[model samples]
Target chain A: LHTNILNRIANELALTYQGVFSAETINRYIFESYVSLARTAKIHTHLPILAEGFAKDRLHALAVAEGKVPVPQVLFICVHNAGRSQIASALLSHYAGSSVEVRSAGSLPASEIHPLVLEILSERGVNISDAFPKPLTDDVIRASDYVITMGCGDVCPMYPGKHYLDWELEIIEEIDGRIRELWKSIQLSQ
Target chain B: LHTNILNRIANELALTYQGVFSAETINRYIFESYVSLARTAKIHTHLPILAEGFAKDRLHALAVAEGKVASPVPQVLFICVHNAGRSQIASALLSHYAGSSVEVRSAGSLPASEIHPLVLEILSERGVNISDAFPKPLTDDVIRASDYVITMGCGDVCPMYPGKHYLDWELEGEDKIQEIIEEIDGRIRELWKSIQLSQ
Candidate 1:
């Protein structure tokens, strides 16, 4: 029965990305995203919505990777994708605004983003309402101009000429500082 | 280095439990808890602290299970997906309000490495301290011992049993940590009152 729900989502997204991905490809992404998310999801009822968002992000990432869309992209990765990476992504997004495309993923994604991280960012006037912990995917990495790793060790693959940074630090203060420097560097490069 | 830290914890807990559990059993529990928690842990630095707390809880649950220790107080278990945020807050709040009248426990279906710092901060703001608290995995001993199984967002992971009260709060934090805490606090008050009348 839920297959129908997923199918409906696939249909909707297929139409949305009609030129980019085939209907079968959309179906596969939707189904795969749903299954991956369900593994750690606390509430199954919310799976369809989460899967839709995740699949949409993947589709967009794929499009960007394939050079169908042109944008400056950055991907932040960490162990759980719930803490440091989420913070870095939000801060970068806030500073870079719409000029840069920011994505965050975990080597092993948690069920949800860390509430403390969310609370801290929200207090700082950063909006992460649409953010959720996502698993690292090749499309996201391939689409990125910068790939930042925070305490996740050697999970991120070495991509030639990709601005790979491993930020070994604790506390949001340091992360925020590093993000500021990163933003400056990206701006300078551009 | 990690093994030495865990060994110290095993020795300490073994001494505390004394005649209740054997040293070998205590070591096994600590090691197993540490390994289980490390699976999803993003940071290994905090695993020792977390593992100690989790193993202690399990040892207590085992004691209660074996009838070596009597727990006349109401046993409550709060659960969520990560056990780092919502469930931790609820359990802390309930423990704060209920005092020794109720025995409170919280676990995650897939427990996180550390309790959310904001969760600890919020509770401390309200004069409830859970500094030593850590996310723990749901276990059969804890499940069997709990009189009330309260699930918040973590689907049907808790095993159902007769003569136990099971409640799913359906409370999602959704970035409203303050509001979620207040809602849970209110629910805990009502739950406490009901338990009072039951006894």
Candidate 2:
């Protein structure tokens, strides 16, 4: 878990905020802080709040998938954090906001969403102005009732005893059109 | 050709003029102009322009499919007054701009040499810039090439081609993304069919 956190932070910083941070600089910080945290905790017996919180979210998501909850939490994952996953997240949130909780993340999160996606959603009066690209974490994966993989391939972690579903579609340039059709399909299914 | 013209007019008017004209008003104008045009030329010859034009512009789309032009044209037609404003605009713009290729035409019984100024201005503003639209009279070869005829505001002078595609897509709606998407979807389906035929 400590290794995973360090890896996630390093990956996120490398992808999102590019500047003059050397590998030595990041490694020193990770060693100083993360190493201390690892030493302080009883690794085998105790779980950190972040991990426990994530676990709770995951269990809740699993319950929702089992139809024990009224609403399902849908997680759409992809690479690049720009096109397909973003579109699916925005559209599902906008069209099914009353019925589902929609979230999206990426294996390698981009700094921002694509400009065209915002334009398309705005055209439909669905504002996603505050949404930011985030890295896919174990908690997010565990908490998701439905795991819809866009073009992330096999990067996403597989949680034990979790329901997974792939919304079979290519991550093409026509993200808006694809998402619109997806929303329509969901409507039809419901 | 007549039906195409009417649909184009309705679409443009809704976008530009905000749907002031009733369907009955538009239909009455189309029937009158079509009847007048039918007296001079055979409907069978003139109506195919719409179909042939849709096929050329859609199946043989200039952007995606290049170096081939002899394929059977999609059977959708668009007609307008002076073959300039609505039908011509729809054909040239949609055929040229859409991802798919379709044959297209704009014809008038009494053809004019130029399209309307507002039509050119409006289309250009929307990035469908067509500055060189020369009006021409409807011809038998064009009708034979088409599979459908769509007439617009012009009074009863449009011809009716036989054994061709036909439909009127005129309806009251804003020029929203949904509408544009629907149009593109229709054109893409036609393109898919054309590609399947080749394979």
Candidate 3:
């Protein structure tokens, strides 16, 4: 099973990075994806790192694709890149289907993603294995097309050309419910 | 001396509320603030309630000034599902840590009657005193003046006030909640310094 999952990911990876990366390079990413998730998560128990495994591949795909195609970039910023930003970026990636470039950062990043955020997302079969608290960077702000934020109540830094939007997302009471309604339609309709 | 301290707090509160409240109302809040902090805080020193007295009154003052006027203090709102535990802890620690540099307030949209005793206990053990805090409903007026809102659990609710800094702190289960006090304090240090730079 271990060999199979790596082989399966590598097969998908090969199609995207071909010629740009060697066979060993593709193998390393798949291995790195598994290792990073296993290292960060609280429990590495039964579930495999499928969510992060795919997230890494897609992220790698984005890195290469950035040089060629113009993917509409959407950056999710919050005060702590722990909960809301993690969920929004995950949801956008799940729903937007690589049609939108999704990134998340915080004015001040926390030590880790909120466990509640993880539980809620994991409950819905969304893998946040790739998510962590990331500090806001100038380049991310510069590259974004739409910077959507929540909770930083009036303190978020702004840029000149980028269009920005604010989302009033509550913690512990509403996010999971919305995901149920939002992601359910996308997955079931498929 | 106690009266002198409370009187000083009332004077400060009056300045914040400014014509919005009279001496009687201000004095009442100061006393309530004293009793509230006195109950929850284990280490009751002369100056312990200093932070809560000023902060509690200002928290109430925000409601009065809402849509009436605005607050000059850069506010930080800590919120959770039940304002009883994590949010309360963060609010107390931040208030103690930041002092008069910034104002800290915490609430629950769906609040609990009292703060979790263990939360108060853990904080007292660590030496950040808390008192006079109850679960508060997260009101639009509260978010209006807030420069930062830190959520404790599932990303659930708050007003979409533009230009505010939003963040969330997540921990796994009820058992491990107390350990997060240090985490909240660490974030508070960063925020207060950030405020110094920005404003």
Candidate 4:
């Protein structure tokens, strides 16, 4: 099962990054990612898929940082990543569409998203069903051009040139306002 | 908070059910549903949402049972231990593929506080939306309303009813979510085909 899952992930990633990354590079990342995720995985049944997602994100970030893939990345941080950060990221993604890559993470992540958050977002015409409470990782932060923190108490690692914004947003409306302003700036920059 | 939540649910449900159910009846279900859900709820933040969903489903089931509402389409219930993951995915997949032809519901023997986050993400990735779907407990009203009761490792929890088709999905101990989803997707397609042929 391990061999087959890794092979499948490696094969897919290799195809995706063929010109940029060789099979060896993609396979190495797959094995390393699977091993890292399995250490703290609560359910082993999902490790393969989880690893694939993690690896894919990691690869994307690597490519972005290396100038292979050129997309503005935004990372939202909050304590739970179950509520505020999730909402902010979802709203940003909704507004940005395919232009900006949006990600959200929890300082200490929860197992699932808050039900009310999902309900509220759905009511607001935002589709964030695919968003989950991922634990904050350096790779994602490094890959992101902008790191936005909302009530997470400042655990985000700082890079020399990374744009860091600490948003004092509490309500959904406030977050939406901030995201809109931020998107306008991004649109102008582009 | 509880009173306000219950009131809001009652008012909305009262308006929707209007002539079919009295305000008193709607209020009763809303309050009872909230109390029942709060008994085992780990997080109180979302109880109102959960209760609203539960009360709405119960009211719909009762309406169908009493012949107030027509059950023209097939009703299917998927059951699992948590009603948070596998069953939720199965229900969503069926709903997406079958559209208005099938009414899909999922319940847990012991419901979780909320759905597993990955379940929503997985479905969302596939362009299937069940974000509004919460983990609800198995109730007789739902069972009575369903034409097919599909169980995934919940084991003898559903009360047997004559004329109801009960199927226990064989992969009970399966821990891999991707595999479980794939298997359930295949089963869902086949089930839809069978339902189509039978109809």
Best by DockQ: 1
Candidate 4 lDDT score relative to the true structure: 0.74
lDDT per residue, candidate 2, B83-127, as tens digits? 655666666655554435555566653444357666666666666
The whole-model lDDT of each prediction reads: 0.76, 0.49, 0.58, 0.74
Query: After superposing candidate 2, which stretches have Cα over 4 Å from the reference?
Result: A1-70, A160-163, A167-190, B1-199
Q: TM-score of candidate 2's chain B against its reference?
A: 0.47
Give DockQ for candidates 1 onward, in order.
0.03, 0.01, 0.01, 0.01
For model 3, residues A1-190, the per-residue Cα lDDT tens digits are: 2446656767777676675554444554454334323222312332145423443533453343335235567777776678887888887776667666677865544657887887776676776665666444333444566777776543333445566778786464465555445445444443
- Candidate 2 chain A lowest-lDDT run of ten: A33-42
lDDT of 4 by residue, A1-190 (tens): 3657678879999999988766755765575456433322333566677778877886787677657766689999887678899888999999999899988876555656887888788788888765656556545766888999887764554565678999885378898899999998888886
Each candidate: chain B TM-score:
0.86, 0.47, 0.64, 0.88
Q: Write the per-residue lDDT of candidate 1 for residues A9-36, one digit (tens) a residue.
A: 9889989987766675566567656655
Q: Candidate 3: which stretches are off by over 4 Å?
A: A1-190, B1-71, B171-175
- TM-score per candidate, chains pooled: 0.50, 0.30, 0.37, 0.49
Per-residue lDDT value at A176 in model 3: 52
Q: Which scores greater on lDDT, model 1 or model 4?
A: 1
Q: At residue B93, what lDDT does model 4 achieve?
A: 93
Q: Which ten residues in a row have the lowest lDDT in candidate 1 chain B?
A: B35-44
Q: Write the per-residue lDDT of candidate 1 for residues B14-56, one digit (tens) a residue.
A: 7987777656456556765665565556336667787787778
